Amino acid sequence: MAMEDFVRQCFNPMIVELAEKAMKEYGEDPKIETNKFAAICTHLEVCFMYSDFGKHRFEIIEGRDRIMAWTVVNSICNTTGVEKPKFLPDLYDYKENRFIEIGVTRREVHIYYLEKANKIEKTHIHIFSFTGEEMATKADYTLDEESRARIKTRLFTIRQEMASRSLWDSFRQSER
Ligand SMILES: Cc1occ(O)c(=O)c1C(=O)O
Ligand SMILES: [Mn+2]
Ligand SMILES: [Mn+2]
Numbered sequence: 001m002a003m004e005d006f007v008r009q010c011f012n013p014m015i016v017e018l019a020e021k022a023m024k025e026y027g028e029d030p031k032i033e034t035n036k037f038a039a040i041c042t043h044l045e046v047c048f049m050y051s052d053f054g055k056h057r058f059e060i061i062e063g064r065d066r067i068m069a070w071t072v073v074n075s076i077c078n079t080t081g082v083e084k085p086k087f088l089p090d091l092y093d094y095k096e097n098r099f100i101e102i103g104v105t106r107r108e109v110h111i112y113y114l115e116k117a118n119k120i121e122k123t124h125i126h127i128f129s130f131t132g133e134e135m136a137t138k139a140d141y142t143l144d145e146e147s148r149a150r151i152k153t154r155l156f157t158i159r160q161e162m163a164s165r166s167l168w169d170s171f172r173q174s175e176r
Helices: 002-010 013-025 034-052 066-080 109-119 145-164 168-173
Strands: 058-060 091-093 098-105 124-129 134-136
Touching (some): 034 091, 034 098, 034 168, 066 091, 145 168
């Protein structure tokens, strides 16, 4: 309940609506799976932030319905030649001409990185934590230092807000 209020109070309403929709399409109640709700919001926000700090360098795939995501991915592949992924990535980088998978973890960045790399094949991976750590494919961080730094500050602030409201301990030990 406190976690549900936190989410509504600290994410802009478009992120909340997107996260909510996603969950109840797949039979998940955001009032029950409150840690999941908050993680979905958090990840979505990072994806939007990462896109925004780009002229139009990044195409946003996360946050669309699957029809549109797959329409976007299909369209990108036919006009670039880049191999088509098996899972929907998060962004396309039109400068580096590669898909990006964004991860946001409350565990060690190397652990989650492995877990994503294993789950994927030419998709660039960029992991962020709530501690100001990141790990990215070939240590290529894609973004400039200021953009990365704004993302990390936002993540650390979510963490501390949660901790203000005694939600961090639950959120940290849970898993999306
Ligand atoms: C489903 C899912 O879970 C965690 C992520 O970081 C994702 O990007 C993702 C997805 O939409 O593919
Ligand atoms: Mn995604
Ligand atoms: Mn992701």
